């Protein structure tokens, strides 16, 4: 304001607030693997 000595001090502004929404989506992968391939593979297909 820069108030004067005697000026009937008036009220000043106040910040206006904004709200931002983060919808928090999901990301999914579903690989299909044959059960016999998992059993007779020399490589650990489950950890790969």
């Amino acid at each position: 304001g820069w108030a004067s000595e005697t000026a009937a001090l008036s009220e000043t502004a106040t910040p206006q607030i904004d709200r931002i929404t983060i919808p928090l989506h999901e990301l999914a992968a579903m690989p299909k693997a044959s059960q016999r391939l998992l059993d007779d593979s020399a490589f650990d297909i489950e950890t790969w």
Binding site: P31, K32, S34, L37, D40
Partner: peptide, 9 residues
């Protein structure tokens, strides 16, 4: 990685 019958898969 599936169906061990197929070579490329």
């Amino acid at each position: 990685a599936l169906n061990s019958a197929v070579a490329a898969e």
